[PDB]
Scaffold this active site. Structure first.
Site, short mmCIF file in Angstrom:
data_model
loop_
_atom_site.label_atom_id
_atom_site.label_comp_id
_atom_site.label_asym_id
_atom_site.label_seq_id
_atom_site.Cartn_x
_atom_site.Cartn_y
_atom_site.Cartn_z
CG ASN B 37 15.28 0.19 -0.63
OD1 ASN B 37 17.05 0.11 -0.49
ND2 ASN B 37 15.02 -0.32 -1.06
CG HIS B 122 6.09 -9.58 3.52
ND1 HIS B 122 6.36 -10.05 5.09
CD2 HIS B 122 5.30 -8.65 3.17
CE1 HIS B 122 6.08 -8.26 4.72
NE2 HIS B 122 5.95 -7.91 3.91
NE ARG B 147 3.75 -9.15 0.40
CZ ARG B 147 4.40 -8.20 -0.64
NH1 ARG B 147 4.80 -7.03 -0.15
NH2 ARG B 147 5.75 -8.61 -0.44
CE1 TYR B 159 7.35 -5.38 -4.00
CE2 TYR B 159 5.31 -6.60 -4.05
CZ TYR B 159 6.23 -5.98 -2.79
OH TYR B 159 7.05 -5.81 -1.19
CG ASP B 210 1.92 -4.82 -3.03
OD1 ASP B 210 1.07 -3.75 -3.83
OD2 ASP B 210 2.98 -4.53 -2.27
CG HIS B 212 4.65 -3.43 -6.46
ND1 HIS B 212 5.84 -2.73 -6.67
CD2 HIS B 212 4.96 -3.78 -4.80
CE1 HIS B 212 6.23 -2.51 -5.90
NE2 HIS B 212 6.16 -2.62 -4.82
CD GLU B 236 0.94 -3.14 -0.06
OE1 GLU B 236 1.83 -2.22 -0.11
OE2 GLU B 236 0.24 -3.94 0.44
CD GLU B 262 5.44 0.19 -1.14
OE1 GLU B 262 3.78 -0.44 -0.46
OE2 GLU B 262 6.21 -0.42 -1.99
NE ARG B 283 0.99 -1.10 1.87
CZ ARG B 283 1.59 -1.56 3.34
NH1 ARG B 283 1.73 -1.52 4.65
NH2 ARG B 283 3.13 -2.01 2.21
CG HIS B 312 6.29 -0.14 3.43
ND1 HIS B 312 6.41 -0.53 2.49
CD2 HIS B 312 7.06 0.60 3.81
CE1 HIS B 312 7.30 -1.16 2.00
NE2 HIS B 312 8.28 0.61 2.79
CG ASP B 316 12.50 -0.03 2.62
OD1 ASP B 316 12.17 -0.98 2.07
OD2 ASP B 316 12.16 1.21 2.02
CD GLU B 339 4.91 -4.28 4.17
OE1 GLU B 339 4.42 -3.38 3.92
OE2 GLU B 339 5.63 -4.98 3.70
CD1 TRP B 402 10.05 -4.26 -9.91
CD2 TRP B 402 9.53 -2.43 -7.94
NE1 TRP B 402 10.36 -4.99 -9.08
CE2 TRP B 402 9.89 -4.23 -7.75
CE3 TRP B 402 9.93 -2.11 -7.21
CZ2 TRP B 402 10.25 -4.36 -6.87
CZ3 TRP B 402 10.41 -2.12 -5.78
CH2 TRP B 402 10.78 -3.41 -5.46
MG MG Z 1 3.81 -3.11 -1.56
#
Ligand code: MG
Ligand code: MG
Lengths: 402, 402
Positions: B37, B122, B147, B159, B210, B212, B236, B262, B283, B312, B316, B339, B402
């Site tokens: 991705n 999600h 999640r 996020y 998450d 993130h 996570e 991930e 993950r 994960h 993507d 996931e 991010w």
């Molecule tokens: Mg994640």
């Protein structure tokens, strides 16, 4: 000011080289090396299709921000391809900053810490006799340090042998060449090479050996101990290091100096090797490990433990990288040595540079920027040509570490 | 038998996907996902210009040898691009082996360890109220795990918020979108989300969050402790993990379960996080970490410390990856959760697969191979379109994670 273009230039004046040229609306431009031997076009795509488009419009003066943008922004962090792209951008931006400052790059890094840059050459032979002769040749030319690599009886194409005299060009075919290897045969032969070198030339010269990932930790410890009587400058890449604990057994058993890192791309690949004092020289380069911005951090961490820089310097690192490496080498306090493999005449012509060699030392010039440029018209006369690094297999066919 | 071709297919049926198709002189073929991705074309080049040419003529039955050939042979090891290419080759070869064996992939791995594969959905909202509503929706649909991600007052584009209901598509623009972030604002808000979720729905459902990469280790420890009363399934990617020691402070201070991985691509990115027992769920995925061959090793190391798999599964990762992931999930003893972000109808059509979803669980079919294929004619109707993942900056402009 803003970046108006970030173009990728590909050329093969003896071997493949990928260069990034960042142009601005101010006129000044900068270039950076992005060459990844054997996987060159992956970086071309990474830059051309993804990174370059993001750079357009950005303020080129913000080196740190851009570095963080491309490093963190990629989301998928680190990696050979990823960091080569980042290194190219970083080199080009520092080139621009130095030009704008009207100073050679080393001045911006903190100024000159030394005059000349000690290098080591590459002596290789099919056997001990021929390798010994080769080292003598470098001694005659005034080299202070020489890396000695010998073919091993019973082993097909030992690393660093038969692919050049003043250099070594591994990527010798359109498809990966297959070389052979046998640890026992090498363990029984390599020590003899250095015994003969010291018997023939004494102990005044620095002698280096590249183990080239062939040994296990215990075997590297064994070899290291067998090499102790010969006082080597270093035993390099003795064992694969994805697992940074791999050097523990080696360090615990020998006082032969250890070096590693040419294939590393971030400080994360070496933080433990350095902090646990498992190495004496870190081999990471400006092109392999994210430019001046990141290499500086690697060198500084190393300095805390008296680990010195020993930048990789094979031919697959373009003159752009060597220019940046020499500015880096001229300033960095914990400089150790700089590997120097000579480029072809065609390569030197395509990449005009302000650095020269004399009596065992390289010297960087005073030209503003990193001192290197690229003759695009001339570069276009040498089309890209696929070339792969060899692979190594044990006698039973087991895929090994070349 | 021999590999006759290793072709790269690119398509964008809702988002970009890169696929490798390995053809043989026997007729049977296999496919593997190579999607990275935001940097998709770098993998296309890595495969098309470098790896694929080497595969021609090789014996596709030698999965391990080929894996070692591409992993060690690259010389520059590990990395996002590098491992995506290797994963694509590995998936395609296992697909071929399963087809030749006349069995669905999970049978070759060791057979079925479970029936259905528990997944998590999600739920996202602009604020706590909307996010709570969202979790209720998943509970109604029969999800066992959810999640929850909420926007934070005063923060721009938190996020996982605002880019889909049953999924989340981050790569929303021709150039990276810039999102905002402020740790203090989040630390003061996130705990309240889970307090409300437990007040509203009780403790029967597994709730995930998450982090993130937004927090420092100490901040993650702080957040982890504040979340303890709510019994989360996991917190996570709480803090960047290039430095595997980053999770030490978190693990020492909280009993909230931790997950990460991930963005990892080799076992070397997680060996310490696992061995030092700093995480509960790894993950890493089949596409991100070198295929079935390598993911199996990661899962096995994790099992020694009772760490479970939590692959994960964002959009993507193509249906090819999900198929392989489900065969993996069906066999692996230390399975934790999978996931599941739903793909678009167009994506499902381009990648026919035998797996299906039902009341909170995914199920893999019995089709020989990994059960997924690619309709090349249909894939050609959706041209590649550049799309980048967003970048995050603190309120003062500092490039962040991010
Ligand atoms: Mg994640
Ligand atoms: Mg070397």
């Amino acid at each position: 000011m803003k970046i108006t273009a970030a173009r990728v230039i590909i050329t093969c004046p003896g071997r493949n080289f990928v260069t990034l040229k960042i142009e601005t609306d101010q006129g000044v431009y900068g270039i950076g090396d992005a060459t990844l031997n054997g996987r060159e076009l992956s970086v071309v795509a990474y830059l051309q299709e993804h990174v370059a488009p993001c750079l357009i419009g950005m303020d080129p003066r913000r080196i740190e921000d851009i570095w963080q943008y491309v490093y963190r922004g990629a989301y998928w962090r680190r990696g050979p391809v990823t960091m080569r792209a980042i290194a190219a951008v970083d080199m080009a931006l520092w080139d621009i900053k130095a030009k704008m400052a009207g100073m050679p790059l080393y001045q911006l890094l903190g100024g000159r810490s030394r005059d000349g840059i000690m290098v080591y050459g590459h002596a290789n032979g099919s056997d001990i006799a021929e390798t010994v002769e080769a080292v003598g040749h470098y001694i005659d030319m005034g080299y202070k340090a020489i890396r000695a690599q010998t073919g091993v009886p019973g082993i097909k194409d030992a690393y660093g042998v038969g692919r050049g005299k003043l250099y070594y060009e591994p990527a010798d075919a359109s498809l990966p060449s297959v070389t052979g290897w046998d640890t026992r045969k090498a363990l029984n032969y390599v020590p003899k090479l250095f015994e003969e070198l010291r018997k023939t030339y004494g102990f005044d010269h620095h002698l280096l050996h590249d183990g080239h990932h062939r040994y296990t930790p215990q075997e590297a410890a064994n070899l290291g101990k067998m090499l102790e009587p010969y006082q080597l400058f270093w035993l390099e890449d003795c064992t694969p290091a994805e697992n940074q604990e791999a050097f523990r057994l080696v360090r615990q058993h020998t006082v032969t100096p250890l070096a590693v890192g040419e294939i590393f791309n971030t400080i994360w690949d070496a933080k433990d090797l350095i902090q646990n004092q498992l190495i004496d020289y870190i081999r990471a380069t400006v092109v392999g490990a994210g430019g001046l911005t990141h290499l500086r951090r690697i060198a500084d961490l190393a300095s805390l433990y008296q680990v010195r820089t020993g930048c990789h310097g094979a031919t697959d690192l373009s003159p752009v990288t060597m220019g940046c490496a020499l500015h880096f080498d001229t300033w960095v306090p914990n400089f150790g040595i700089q590997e120097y493999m000579r480029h072809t005449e065609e390569t030197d012509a395509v990449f005009p540079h302000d650095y020269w060699f004399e009596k065992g030392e390289l010297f960087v010039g005073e030209t503003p920027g990193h001192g290197v440029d690229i003759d695009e018209e001339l570069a276009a006369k040498y089309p890209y040509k696929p070339a792969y690094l060899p692979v190594a297999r044990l006698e039973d066919g087991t895929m090994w570490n070349w």
